[PDB]
Design a protein around this ligand. Structure first.
Ligand SMILES: [Cl-]
Ligand code: NA
Lengths: 282, 278
């Protein structure tokens, strides 16, 4: 009599809204995948789990108000900057509003992915163009190798990955004048300096290279933590650059999400809904 | 007549970019040839001067004044119990409207679309965090943010489309301690900024609010306010508060005796106050 037409056991799962709530509260993947015998039992369970997550979130915030005095993104930002200053890197801060011409020299499709302000101005989608400019200026006053980096807000109307941030923080460190034979090792050095300062000790370096060049993608498992490029590059011509170089770029909110193992990348980004990884309406 | 030959428009602007002393900017000469020769001498002097300043950045600091002041200010405030926050630089049209004294600022911002724009000030975002935090923590709540703000126009001769604001506030300040709290903030900020000479000018001209202005002579260092305020209603704020805002590149220009406020702002033509074409 085991024919049974009935449905499998624990077939009632979270409603999309319960699921989203548990995610904002950084529930575990196990908790997110829980099934129940029926809706009432599930709703009941939901309330209990939410309750515990809200409690944990409030405790975390206490730490912020009496101890840290600043959220992870800002703590991470100061942490990364000091570590690079100790390695001789000069930190710069450039315009977040860049021109269409600057943007053009970077490739098209990226034009449809940026927030335009008018026909000639837009919010920078990356830090590269601005650092290219500083390279050209600094190379005329300083001796190579020139080490420069910037940590700052970038904007994109859309992106890859399963999640998206219109406003994100990028760390982009570079060295202009790197000896060709040492390029691959510099990228490694940079990755290590950064990942070490970021409290991440588990990661792998993925190198690829095909036609228009040699790229080094830093990752943890199937998780990308950063992408580095190498010069001479195809674009070097438009920016009047002719020295070898290396550059590595990181998404800090993404780094934080991966290090902390949180659910939403928004949890530690610039926000009015979260603070230091905690959803505020708790 | 004697020394009645002055800098040409071009020579004046160039010297201005090089952050000439001002005295140098008013120098006169006996003739047009003696002037140009003086120009060349003074320029190369300022250029050499700029190159050495960049050496301090290259070998000593490793970061420009704006970033140095940012870290210095933040820590100073962390020491006084202020929690630092970082909010969106893109705000809604609805939020901007709740800032309108009455029911103007719209032609001052950069719109991304009919509903979004670049924040021209930090207040709306702080107003929000206030409401949220007050439900989790007991008053007084002390928070601040240092971040980029945007405006198409502003008061004064000089203008930055991109500028850095430090806005520190306290929600729950005892009504009778507001003025003192405003002074406490100004002192904590300016001491950390390297500026000790300053006065606070209260206006109290209500129907607009009990404002305050931090001055360094005829120069403004910051602008502040306090609640209850007629705007608190829209933001569902019911407690007394104090707030003070500082434009960091302006603070820097003032402390360093710089010519263009752009010299220490986000830029591709300047760096740590030094014009890059040498
Ligand atoms: Cl506009
Ligand atoms: Na993404």
């Amino acid at each position: 009599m085991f024919l049974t037409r009935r449905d499998p056991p624990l077939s009632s799962f979270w409603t999309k809204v319960q699921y989203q709530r548990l995610k904002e509260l950084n529930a575990s993947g196990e908790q997110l995948e829980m099934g129940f015998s029926d809706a009432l039992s599930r709703d009941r369970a939901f309330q209990g789990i939410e309750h515990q997550l809200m409690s944990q979130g409030k405790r975390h915030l206490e730490q912020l108000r009496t101890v840290k005095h600043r959220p992870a993104l800002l703590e991470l930002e100061e942490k990364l900057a000091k570590a690079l200053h100790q390695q001789g890197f000069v930190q710069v801060v450039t315009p977040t509003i860049i021109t269409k011409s600057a943007l053009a020299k970077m490739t098209h499709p990226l034009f449809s992915q940026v927030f335009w302000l008018d026909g000639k101005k837009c919010l920078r989608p990356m830090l590269a163009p601005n650092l290219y400019t500083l390279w050209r200026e600094l190379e005329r006053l300083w001796d190579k190798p020139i080490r420069i980096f910037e940590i700052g807000t970038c904007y994109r109307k859309e992106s890859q990955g399963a999640q998206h941030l219109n406003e994100f923080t990028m760390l982009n460190l570079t060295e202009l004048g790197t000896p060709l034979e040492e390029r691959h090792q510099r990228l490694e050095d940079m990755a290590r300096w950064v990942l070490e300062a970021a409290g991440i000790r588990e990661f792998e370096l993925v190198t690829e290279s095909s036609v228009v060049g040699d790229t080094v993608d830093v990752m943890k498992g199937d998780l990308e933590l950063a992408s580095g490029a190498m010069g001479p590059h195809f674009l070097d011509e438009k920016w009047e650059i002719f020295d070898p170089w290396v550059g590595l770029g990181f998404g800090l909110e993404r780094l934080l999400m991966i290090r902390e193992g949180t659910q939403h990348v928004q949890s530690m980004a610039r926000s009015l809904s979260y603070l230091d990884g905690v959803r505020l309406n708790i």
